Amino acid sequence: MVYSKEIVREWLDEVAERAKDYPEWVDVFERCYTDTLDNTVEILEDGSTFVLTGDIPAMWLRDSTAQLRPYLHVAKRDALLRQTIAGLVKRQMTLVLKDPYANSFNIEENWKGHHETDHTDLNGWIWERKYEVDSLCYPLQLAYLLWKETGETSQFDEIFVAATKEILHLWTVEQDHKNSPYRFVRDTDRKEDTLVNDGFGPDFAVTGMTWSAFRPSDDCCQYSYLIPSNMFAVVVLGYVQEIFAALNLADSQSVIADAKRLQDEIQEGIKNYAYTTNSKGEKIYAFEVDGLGNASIMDDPNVPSLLAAPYLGYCSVDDEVYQATRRTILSSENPYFYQGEYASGLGSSHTFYRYIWPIALSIQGLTTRDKAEKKFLLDQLVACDGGTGVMHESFHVDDPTLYSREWFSWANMMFCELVLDYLDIR
Numbered sequence: 001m002v003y004s005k006e007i008v009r010e011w012l013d014e015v016a017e018r019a020k021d022y023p024e025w026v027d028v029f030e031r032c033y034t035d036t037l038d039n040t041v042e043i044l045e046d047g048s049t050f051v052l053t054g055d056i057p058a059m060w061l062r063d064s065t066a067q068l069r070p071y072l073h074v075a076k077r078d079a080l081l082r083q084t085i086a087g088l089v090k091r092q093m094t095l096v097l098k099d100p101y102a103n104s105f106n107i108e109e110n111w112k113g114h115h116e117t118d119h120t121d122l123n124g125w126i127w128e129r130k131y132e133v134d135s136l137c138y139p140l141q142l143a144y145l146l147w148k149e150t151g152e153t154s155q156f157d158e159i160f161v162a163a164t165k166e167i168l169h170l171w172t173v174e175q176d177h178k179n180s181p182y183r184f185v186r187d188t189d190r191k192e193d194t195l196v197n198d199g200f201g202p203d204f205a206v207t208g209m210t211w212s213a214f215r216p217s218d219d220c221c222q223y224s225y226l227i228p229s230n231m232f233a234v235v236v237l238g239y240v241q242e243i244f245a246a247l248n249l250a251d252s253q254s255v256i257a258d259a260k261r262l263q264d265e266i267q268e269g270i271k272n273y274a275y276t277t278n279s280k281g282e283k284i285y286a287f288e289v290d291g292l293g294n295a296s297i298m299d300d301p302n303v304p305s306l307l308a309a310p311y312l313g314y315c316s317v318d319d320e321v322y323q324a325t326r327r328t329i330l331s332s333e334n335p336y337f338y339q340g341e342y343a344s345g346l347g348s349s350h351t352f353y354r355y356i357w358p359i360a361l362s363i364q365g366l367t368t369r370d371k372a373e374k375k376f377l378l379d380q381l382v383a384c385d386g387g388t389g390v391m392h393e394s395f396h397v398d399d400p401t402l403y404s405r406e407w408f409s410w411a412n413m414m415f416c417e418l419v420l421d422y423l424d425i426r
Contacts, residue, residue, distance in 0.1 A: 002041050003071075003081035011074040018423050024382050029419050031389050032412035036067050040409050041084065048094070049087035050107055054407060057107045058127035061092055062216055065138035066303070067409045070416045072149040073425060082150050089146060089155035092139035093163035095125065100166045101182050103135045103218070104128040119185040119199065131182055131213040133174075133229035134304050136167045137236045144239035153247060161250050164240060168258045171233065175265065177204060177211040177224065184213055192219035192349055205291030208269030210262075216302035217350045223288035223296065227274045228304035230266050231314040237263035275321070279333055282324040285309070298336055299329040301346040301357030301394075303414075311366045318369075330364070340397025342384055347394065351404055355394035358384070362391075362414035366421055374422050381415055391415045 012033065016026045040052045053063035068085055075082040095105045104127035106112050113127035120129050143160065146152050173179055183199035195201045195213055201224055204211065209225040210233060240259040244252040276286040276295040285306050286295035299306040306325055310317040329346075331337055336347045338354050345356035345364070358381055365377035381391065384400035391412045393405035405411075420426075 001080065002043060002084050003037065003074075004078045007078040008037070008074055008081070011077060015420070015423065015425065018425070019419065022378075025378055025419055028382050028385065028389050028391075029416055032391060033070070033416050035390070035407075036409045036413055037071065040067060043084070043087065044091070044107075047087060048091040049084050050091055051088060053409060054405075056127070058104050058113065059091075059095070059107070060104050061095070061135040062103065062132070062138050063410050064088060064092065065142040067413050068142070069145065070413050070420065072145060073420065075146075075150050082146075082152055085142070085146050085150075086152050086155045089139060089143045090157065090159065092142065093155075093159045096136065096139060096163040096166060097159060098125045099123060099129065100136060100163075100170045101131040102126045102129045103132050103214070104130075114186070117187045119187070120183060121181075128218075129184060130218055131184065132216055132218070133171075133210060133212040133226060134216045134232055136170065137229065137232040137304070140164070140167065140236040140239055141232075144236070144243060147243065156243065156247055156249060158250065161255070164244075164255060165251075168240075168255070168262060171210045171262055171266075172258075174211040175208060175262075176206050177201065180211070182213070195220055202290065203292060207273045207289070207291035208265040209273065209291075210266060215300055216304060217300050217348055219349045221288055223290035223294050225269070225273065225289045225291060227270065227285055227287055227289065228299075228306050228309065228312075230270055230274075231309055232304040232312050234263055234266050234270070235313045237266070278324065278328045282328075283321055284325040284328050285321065297328065298334050299325075299346060300336065301348050301360035301363075302350075303359065303363060305360065305363065307346070307360060307367060308363045309367075311363060317367055326367070338397050342400050343380055343395075343397050345397075351394040352396075354398065355396050355402070355404065357394050357411070358391040359393075359411045359414050362411070362418045365418045366414075371422070374418065378418060378422060381418075 019026050042050050044050050051059050051064035053060050105125050106127050109124035111124040143155050184195050185199040186194040204224045209230045211224045212226045214220050237259045241256050244255045273289050278284050287298045289295040309315050315322050338347050338356050346360040347356050361377050365374040384395055386401040386403050392403040393408045395403040
């Protein structure tokens with residue numbers, strides 16, 4: 001038993017009433033919201049929560065957080081769903097202790113997943129072991145957001161503390177990847193799916209930022225300091241300080257100090273290495289840097305992205321450098337910016353040329369104060385659904401009946417987030 005049907009239905013009724021001038025949004029909103037809740041969420045024998053991301057019995061730390069985030073509003077009313085979200089944080093943290101370098105975990109210790117192709121330290125709980133900094137950001141973000149929105153604190157247990165320590169340790173080790181016990185090689189012809197230099201990745205200098213193998217797209221980093229993931233790290237490291245101080249958790253003085261030191265070191269790394277210049281000579285954030293002087297000018301639709309920086313809480317939407325970066329990202333100066341008959345937006349190394357991501361359109365609306373822009377993007381999201389009434393991974397700018405991922409809950413839920421944002425439901 002996952003949530004209260006009666007309370008959720010009543011909440012959805014209220015949302016529908018507020019959005020009554022936009023039946024087409026309500027149609028898609030209810031379809032996305034209910035699908036995720038009814039088909040991806042399950043309670044395990046130990047009472048914790050496992051969240052599927054599609055059909056495969058595996059949970060991404062990233063997807064599971066993003067999928068359940070918009071249930072926080074109704075979780076203020078539905079105490080059962082509040083337990084369910086608490087149970088997800090507990091399962092995420094338990095899994096982090098299993099292996100903090102893994103992005104995706106099995107429902108039980110079953111050795112399902114990518115083990116036949118993947119050369120790396122593996123155990124039976126790991127579906128995939130692509131190390132992505134954001135994977136460890138997302139559970140801390142969820143734990144914090146659950147606490148702030150509902151007041152729930154049961155997720156802050158001893159496994160939470162142990163997992164927090166593991167994250168701080170890993171992030172610190174990875175401030176100089178020369179010392180890392182992580183290597184990853186996949187037997188594949190697709191180079192985005194494996195790391196260069198026999199599993200070690202590209203060259204880097206120490207910058208104070210923390211190293212990543214892969215992006216939230218699951219494609220490998222071109223340079224190792226992935227700017228939007230270090231931004232998210234800075235934010236959740238603030239969350240860690242707030243949580244440990246407020247709740248007098250075991251070893252607070254130590255954890256707070258480590259988190260603060262790490263935060264300040266990553267912040268300084270961003271300040272010294274994250275910036276570059278666009279065609280017009282404006283200062284902008286780079287997407288990836290190596291500390292050796294290379295810095296790419298682009299953004300990827302997967303979050304954390306440079307576009308999502310204010311949505312992640314890293315900077316103000318009004319920040320000058322953010323706005324310059326956003327102008328550059330949403331233009332052909334970004335090699336993943338695509339323009340067509342039906343829409344313009346952001347493609348990815350992970351999807352076909354000319355296909356753009358609803359998720360980045362949702363994030364675009366979530367990161368502008370312009371209500372007309374939010375409305376435009378919402379209308380565009382529903383108009384470009386290929387007649388399916390749900391959100392896809394990517395769709396072709398000249399023909400949205402061409403698209404990838406029939407069932408993509410993350411995108412479904414980010415649509416819901418933009419709708420709630422438009423409605424000032426907060």
